[PDB]
Design an enzyme around this catalytic site. Structure first.
Site, PDB file in Angstrom:
ATOM      1  N   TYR A  53      13.800  -3.966   1.831  1.00  0.00           N
ATOM      2  CA  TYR A  53      14.946  -2.902   2.276  1.00  0.00           C
ATOM      3  C   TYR A  53      14.299  -1.485   2.897  1.00  0.00           C
ATOM      4  CZ  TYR A  53      14.991   0.858  -1.374  1.00  0.00           C
ATOM      5  OH  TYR A  53      14.944   1.791  -2.388  1.00  0.00           O
ATOM      6  N   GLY A  76       8.588  -3.300   3.652  1.00  0.00           N
ATOM      7  CA  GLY A  76       8.741  -3.889   2.285  1.00  0.00           C
ATOM      8  C   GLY A  76      10.084  -4.156   2.134  1.00  0.00           C
ATOM      9  N   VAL A 106       8.620   0.766   8.210  1.00  0.00           N
ATOM     10  CA  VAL A 106       8.172   2.108   8.771  1.00  0.00           C
ATOM     11  C   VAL A 106       7.467   2.033  10.079  1.00  0.00           C
ATOM     12  CG1 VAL A 106       6.092   3.828   8.153  1.00  0.00           C
ATOM     13  CG2 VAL A 106       7.496   2.816   6.253  1.00  0.00           C
ATOM     14  N   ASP A 120       3.469   5.208 -10.619  1.00  0.00           N
ATOM     15  CA  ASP A 120       2.695   4.070  -9.447  1.00  0.00           C
ATOM     16  C   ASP A 120       1.768   4.177  -8.710  1.00  0.00           C
ATOM     17  OD1 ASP A 120       3.131   1.183  -8.961  1.00  0.00           O
ATOM     18  OD2 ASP A 120       4.339   1.681  -7.401  1.00  0.00           O
TER      19      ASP A 120
HETATM   20  C1  LIG Z   1       4.011   5.937   0.170  1.00  0.00           C
HETATM   21  C2  LIG Z   1       4.225   6.446   1.800  1.00  0.00           C
HETATM   22  S1  LIG Z   1       5.224   5.158   2.553  1.00  0.00           S
HETATM   23  O1  LIG Z   1       4.802   3.891   2.584  1.00  0.00           O
HETATM   24  O2  LIG Z   1       6.548   5.599   2.340  1.00  0.00           O
HETATM   25  N1  LIG Z   1       5.028   5.519   4.235  1.00  0.00           N
HETATM   26  C3  LIG Z   1       5.501   6.745   4.797  1.00  0.00           C
HETATM   27  C4  LIG Z   1       4.832   7.916   5.005  1.00  0.00           C
HETATM   28  C5  LIG Z   1       3.695   7.319   5.828  1.00  0.00           C
HETATM   29  C6  LIG Z   1       2.733   8.074   6.825  1.00  0.00           C
HETATM   30  N2  LIG Z   1       1.799   7.800   7.446  1.00  0.00           N
HETATM   31  C7  LIG Z   1       1.493   6.546   7.346  1.00  0.00           C
HETATM   32  N3  LIG Z   1       0.491   5.914   8.070  1.00  0.00           N
HETATM   33  C8  LIG Z   1       0.126   4.533   7.957  1.00  0.00           C
HETATM   34  C9  LIG Z   1      -0.801   4.100   9.455  1.00  0.00           C
HETATM   35  C10 LIG Z   1      -1.584   2.803   9.012  1.00  0.00           C
HETATM   36  O3  LIG Z   1      -2.431   2.783   7.971  1.00  0.00           O
HETATM   37  C11 LIG Z   1      -1.443   2.905   6.610  1.00  0.00           C
HETATM   38  C12 LIG Z   1      -0.671   4.278   6.732  1.00  0.00           C
HETATM   39  N4  LIG Z   1       2.111   5.465   6.523  1.00  0.00           N
HETATM   40  C13 LIG Z   1       3.208   6.087   5.882  1.00  0.00           C
HETATM   41  C14 LIG Z   1       3.822   4.978   4.939  1.00  0.00           C
END
Ligand SMILES: *CCS(=O)(=O)N1CCc2cnc(NC3CCOCC3)nc2C1
Length: 345
Positions: A26, A24, A29, A139
């Site tokens: 700045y 996204g 992940v 949100d």
């Molecule tokens: C709102 C959560 S985030 O976008 O900050 N972020 C951090 C925490 C987290 C944990 N697990 C996952 N797993 C993915 C695997 C692939 O499908 C989407 C979720 N993502 C986040 C994203």
């Protein structure tokens, strides 16, 4: 160190075997192996210090997630940053790794009535804890709802969250930009700053409609089109609901519209459980004052197999007021982020 998709990711030595997840503005992940807990985790890299607004969102998210402790809310496991304010350029947030998000699931999978029921319960259970702390998510959307392999749900992204302020909620017509368009309550476009708990309920109603059909219920193509979609389903607001709208510009816009009839929920969702449609109607109510609250939604007959008030906890310490950081310089916000993250050093 470690590099991912042409970008520095200095999380080692504790976190290794890095794999890109998504990106996204700045924020980036990655998944990584935690050598201490012997499990894979999610690591988000943030670099907000050049922008005052990015510092605002970073601080808000960190302060909220460190105070909250709930099964349906993503927690913060670790925070990685330089040992000094001068050397701090990036912040790394370590969180539980989740299998998918509701957005990705809704794009390819049909949900059973049991899944919809379990998912809605967990969203409302998390939202009861958030509202009890006097916090508004603002949100709520499928992409902010993470799921593990056993369908346990966790609410994430508190970057746009605020302390509830119903007294200072009134505003002018077509001014506010609260939530993601498709999940925006009708009052945002008419007379609300989105400072009441009822705006989260509307978003939850939109998510429920989306779980029933695998399509957004109000897919506005742009900001001004959103109210057209909502009124196209709900129909023209009643005289009683218009009396609640005192702003002449917002009221006269609604009065200028031709009469539209309510499209019945059973016609839109013929496969849906009748109890789910009754609850949906109550969440997607035009008048925010008549809209169902989180505790009433939990007690609805649709959720009777899960409802247990003694196992739906509330926050120990609610947020008294919002932090005056809309005018705090980026330098002062950097110190606060530094102070808030010190416990992880
Ligand atoms: C709102 C959560 S985030 O976008 O900050 N972020 C951090 C925490 C987290 C944990 N697990 C996952 N797993 C993915 C695997 C692939 O499908 C989407 C979720 N993502 C986040 C994203």
């Amino acid at each position: 160190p470690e590099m991912v998709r042409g970008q520095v990711f200095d999380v080692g030595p504790r976190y290794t075997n890095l794999s890109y997840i998504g990106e996204g503005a700045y924020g980036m992940v990655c998944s990584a192996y935690d050598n201490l807990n012997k499990v894979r985790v999610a690591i988000k890299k943030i670099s907000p210090f050049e922008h005052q607004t990015y510092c605002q969102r970073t601080l808000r998210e960190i302060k909220i997630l460190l105070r909250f402790r709930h099964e349906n809310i993503i927690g913060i496991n670790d925070i990685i940053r330089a040992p000094t304010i001068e050397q701090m350029k990036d912040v790394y947030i370590v969180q539980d790794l989740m299998e998918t998000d509701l957005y990705k699931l809704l794009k390819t999978q049909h949900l059973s009535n049991d899944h919809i029921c379990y998912f809605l319960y967990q969203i409302l259970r998390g939202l009861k804890y958030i509202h009890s702390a006097n916090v508004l998510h603002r949100d709520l959307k499928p992409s902010n709802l993470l799921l593990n392999t056993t369908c346990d749900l966790k609410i994430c992204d508190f970057g746009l969250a605020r302390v509830a302020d119903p007294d200072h909620d009134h505003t002018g017509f077509l001014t506010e930009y609260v939530a993601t368009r498709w999940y925006r309550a009708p009052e945002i476009m008419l007379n609300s700053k989105g400072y009441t708990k009822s705006i989260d309920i509307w978003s939850v109603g939109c998510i429920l409609a989306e779980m029933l059909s695998n399509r957004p219920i109000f897919p506005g193509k742009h900001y001004l089109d959103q109210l057209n979609h909502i009124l196209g389903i709900l129909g023209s607001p009643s005289q009683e609901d218009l009396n609640c709208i005192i702003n002449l510009k917002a009221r006269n816009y609604l009065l200028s519209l031709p009469h539209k009839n309510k499209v019945p929920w059973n016609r839109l969702f013929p496969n849906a459980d009748s109890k789910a449609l009754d609850l949906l109607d109550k969440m997607l109510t035009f008048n925010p004052h008549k809209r169902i609250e989180v505790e009433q939604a939990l007690a609805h007959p649709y959720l009777e197999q899960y409802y247990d008030p003694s196992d739906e906890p509330i926050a120990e310490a609610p947020f008294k007021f919002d932090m005056e950081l809309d005018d705090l310089p980026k330098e002062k916000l950097k110190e606060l982020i530094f102070e808030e993250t010190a416990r992880f050093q």
